[PDB]
């Protein structure tokens, strides 16, 4: 897990992570303290999928 | 363990009050060792704190503090009036407070 910093984009993260040995990138989109989407990118130039999440529950719940 | 405690012990007696009206914004503090209003002049302006512990480990710590300052003496016996950043809870009557030595003029 790496905290998103500044104005680095998903494609920039993907091309940078492709040189770090990573193979899949998962970006959790949240707005107003609620995660609602998830885009997963297959590295280095693989397919990209976009899902919208719902019914998010954690172990304590 | 007697190589610590740069502060002075104190007790939170009450708020400033008349017979039937209480003023929680200013608190009456009994600094131990101070036995008159002339000795209370040394502790004027000194930082005083109330140190307590709460269940949640917020900030990665179990202890939280309310800071304050000593404003003026109260009465003849050496009690002082202290104004804290947050008004001290009424449950802390008879609780312990710490009177530092700073801001020091000594």
């Amino acid at each position: 897990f790496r905290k998103r910093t500044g104005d680095i984009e998903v494609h920039e993260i993907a091309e940078a992570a492709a040189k770090r040995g990573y193979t899949d990138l998962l970006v959790l989109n949240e707005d107003r303290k609620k995660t609602n989407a998830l885009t997963l990118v297959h590295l280095p130039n693989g397919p990209s999928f976009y899902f919208t999440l719902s019914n998010l529950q954690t172990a304590k719940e | 363990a007697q190589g610590h405690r740069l502060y002075v012990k104190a007790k939170h007696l009450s708020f400033q009050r008349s017979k039937h009206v209480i003023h929680p914004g200013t608190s009456i503090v009994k600094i131990e060792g101070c036995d008159s209003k002339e000795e209370a002049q040394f502790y004027l302006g000194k930082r005083v704190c109330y140190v307590y512990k709460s269940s949640k480990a917020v900030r990665g710590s179990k202890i939280r503090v309310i800071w304050g300052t000593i404003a003026r003496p109260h009465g003849n016996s050496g009690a002082v009036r202290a104004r804290f950043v947050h008004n001290l809870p009424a449950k802390t009557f008879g609780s312990s407070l710490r009177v530092m030595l700073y801001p020091s003029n000594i």
């Binding site: 984009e9 970006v27 989109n29 | -």
Partner: protein, 124 residues
């Protein structure tokens, strides 16, 4: 001239908590024998003109701006010369299509929007 509020609690009508039929909207008591009208000790306060707030800081949000109601892109462009004094507040009945257009326009004008995240999602 930072924002100072002489009072933050509301003025609740007397006996409004006792009775559900009685609303909490302030009503001036008219009973002569009522202790609230006579302003005894321990009773609830009453709206007085002394509670009024500073004219310079009146109507100002905690960030120092005044809320200006906005319903379309024409209303946002009005705050071009007053972006340091007013914040745009989109109306509640403006659709999510117009809300998007308002929010992009306000961003170029340098205008703060109070509810810029309503009825929309994000996709980076």
């Amino acid at each position: 001239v930072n924002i100072i509020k002489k009072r933050t609690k509301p003025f609740k009508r007397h006996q409004s908590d006792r009775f559900k039929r009685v609303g909490e909207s302030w009503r001036k008591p008219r009973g002569i024998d009522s202790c609230v009208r006579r302003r005894f000790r321990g009773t609830i306060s009453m709206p007085k003109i002394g509670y009024g707030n500073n004219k310079k800081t009146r109507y100002c949000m905690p960030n120092g701006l005044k809320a200006f109601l906005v319903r379309n892109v024409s209303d946002v462009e009005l705050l071009l010369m007053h972006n340091k004094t007013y914040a745009a507040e989109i109306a509640g009945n403006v659709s999510a299509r117009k809300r998007v257009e308002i929010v992009e326009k306000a961003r170029a004008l340098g205008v703060k929007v109070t509810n810029a995240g309503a009825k929309v999602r994000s996709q980076e």
